[PDB]
Amino acid sequence: HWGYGKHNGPEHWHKDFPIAKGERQSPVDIDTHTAKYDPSLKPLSVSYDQATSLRILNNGCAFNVEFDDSQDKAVLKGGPLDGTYRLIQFHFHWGSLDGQGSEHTVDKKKYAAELHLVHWNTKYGDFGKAVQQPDGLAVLGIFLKVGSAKPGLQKVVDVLDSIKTKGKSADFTNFDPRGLLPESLDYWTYPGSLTTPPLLECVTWIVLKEPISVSSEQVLKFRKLNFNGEGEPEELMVDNWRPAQPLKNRQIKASFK
Ligand SMILES: *SCCNC(=O)CC(c1ccccc1)c1ccccc1
Ligand SMILES: [Zn+2]
């Protein structure tokens, strides 16, 4: 029932999901002049060399690339995190225009899109249990800007034709998410939530400072997806992003000076 339109978008979510007006909601604006370098933060470890993707799905909200998380194949460790967090999936949020689309902002700047690499804490055994824990998830957020094409994204872009509408999925094996990372692993980190209902406050956010560049043609293909299901009237999948929420009683820490 919730969505991203005028009668059911983010300003309405609180009626079915009162936690939307919560104490640690995401996304937020990242005030780079207020975030503090934290020297306690240990180095970030992104270990994706044995990653195993399975499938890509249009769920009506975005598209997810799903991974085999039955073992420690692609994991996130270090930084602010205690323990190992398993890659379960990734997705994007993007806009109708290159001037908007990200969820997090940097000094109020909106990027063209935002990549979320979603990982869960292995100490809680599965994702569904992890989301009911304040330290259950770790999401790696990577901003997208429009410029030169991102070669590691092209495999993703090409399959989208086969998952145009809500409920469609396709085989997506042997995709390597290392091709979606920037050079630098400099990040900001804060405690927050999922950015769609149920909006659970179970996330440790890790947002890379360095955006990746994608081409105009690549993001235009994202914009051709549909929110609707097959044989329903076309509603382009665009602007599936939730805006910045109140930081309230939280501190954003930086991994770099
Ligand atoms: S079209 C709805 C899209 N959202 C889902 O993928 C739901 C999913 C979730 C959350 C809480 C419990 C079970 C499943 C999810 C949402 C955001 C990030 C990761 C997973
Ligand atoms: Zn997301």
UniProtKB/Swiss-Prot annotation:
Main location: cytoplasm
The protein's name: Carbonic anhydrase 2
Pfam families the record matches: Carb_anhydrase
Outcome of substituting residue 116 to D/N/Q: Reduced activity
Effect of residue 4 to F: Enhanced activity
UniProt enzyme class: lyase
SMART domains: Carb_anhydrase
SUPFAM superfamilies for this protein: Carbonic anhydrase
Annotated phenotype, changing residue 59 to V: Reduced activity
Impact upon substituting residue 116 to E: Strongly reduced activity
Summary of activators and inhibitors of this protein: Activated by X-ray, histamine, L-adrenaline, L- and D-phenylalanine, L- and D-histidine, L-His-OMe and beta-Ala-His (carnosine).
Phenotypic consequence of residue 64 to L: Reduced activity
PANTHER family for the chain: CARBONIC ANHYDRASE, CARBONIC ANHYDRASE 2
One Gene Ontology cellular component: extracellular exosome
Additional free-text comment from the UniProt record: Target of drugs used in treatments against glaucoma disorder and breast cancer.
Subunit text: Interacts with SLC4A4. Interaction with SLC4A7 regulates SLC4A7 transporter activity. Interacts with SLC26A6 isoform 4 (via C-terminus cytoplasmic domain).
Description of pH dependence: Optimum pH is 6-8.
Site (Fine-tunes the proton-transfer properties of H-64): 4, 59, 64
Family matches, as InterPro entries: CA_dom (IPR001148), CA_dom_sf (IPR036398), Carbonic_anhydrase_a-class (IPR023561), Carbonic_anhydrase_a-class_CS (IPR018338)
Reported impact of residue 59 to T: Reduced activity
Family stated for the protein in its record: Belongs to the alpha-carbonic anhydrase family.
Disorder cited: Osteopetrosis, autosomal recessive 3: A rare genetic disease characterized by abnormally dense bone, due to defective resorption of immature bone. Osteopetrosis occurs in two forms: a severe autosomal recessive form occurring in utero, infancy, or childhood, and a benign autosomal dominant form occurring in adolescence or adulthood. Recessive osteopetrosis commonly manifests in early infancy with macrocephaly, feeding difficulties, evolving blindness and deafness, bone marrow failure, severe anemia, and hepatosplenomegaly.
Cofactor(s) for this UniProt protein: Zn(2+); Co(2+)
